[PDB]
């Protein structure tokens, strides 16, 4: 199963039409800033395909 293809799955806002966004900031879920640390209250905004 190819794993190259990827997609955003965690973004703080919806997309206005014809708007691209390729930022790579860990999505904060809790009330503590991620500061580049994934794990608790922090999720990577992307997810791949199999």
């Amino acid at each position, epitope marked *: 199963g190819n794993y190259n293809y990827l997609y955003r799955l965690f973004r703080k806002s919806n997309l206005k039409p014809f708007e691209r966004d390729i930022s790579t900031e860990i999505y904060q*879920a*809790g009330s503590t800033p991620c500061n580049g640390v994934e*794990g*608790f*209250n922090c999720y990577f905004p992307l997810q791949s395909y*199999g």
Partner: nanobody, 120 residues
Framework: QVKLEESGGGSVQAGGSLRLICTAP????????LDWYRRAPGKEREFVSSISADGTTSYADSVKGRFTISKDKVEDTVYLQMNSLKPEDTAIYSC???????????????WGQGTSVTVS
């Protein structure tokens, strides 16, 4: 207020065999990922193995070839069978899982205590 468990260790030599039991109560519903970790005395906690929500498995470089992680079809109690034990395996295992809170069903991550094995 106990949400996970770790047991199944023992005191067996290098080359011995035994089965581990990470009993997850409702991870099928929770559908969050699972990781096996271990700690060695005097050293910080180190990664051991990972299993995802879809059944993709991954093993550490110091454990690849002999460790076998598997997930139940029902009644989540994930197994980490160890075989061909080596003296480097003396450490304490632990689990980690995520649970619902604020509605979102992973946000609260929670760790079990852990169970130690001494390999001679």
């Amino acid at each position: 207020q106990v949400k996970l468990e770790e047991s199944g260790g023992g005191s067996v030599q290098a080359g011995g065999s035994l089965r581990l039991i990470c009993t997850a109560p409702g991870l099928t519903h929770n559908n969050c990922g699972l990781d096996w970790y271990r700690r060695a005395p005097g050293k910080e906690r180190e990664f051991v193995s990972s299993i995802s929500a879809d059944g993709t498995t991954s093993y550490a470089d110091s454990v690849k070839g002999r460790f076998t992680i598997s997930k139940d079809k029902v009644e989540d109690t994930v197994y980490l069978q160890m075989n061909s034990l080596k003296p480097e395996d003396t450490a304490i295992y632990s689990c980690k899982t995520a649970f619902p809170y604020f509605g979102n069903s992973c946000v609260l991550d929670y760790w079990g205590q852990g169970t130690s094995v001494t390999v001679s």
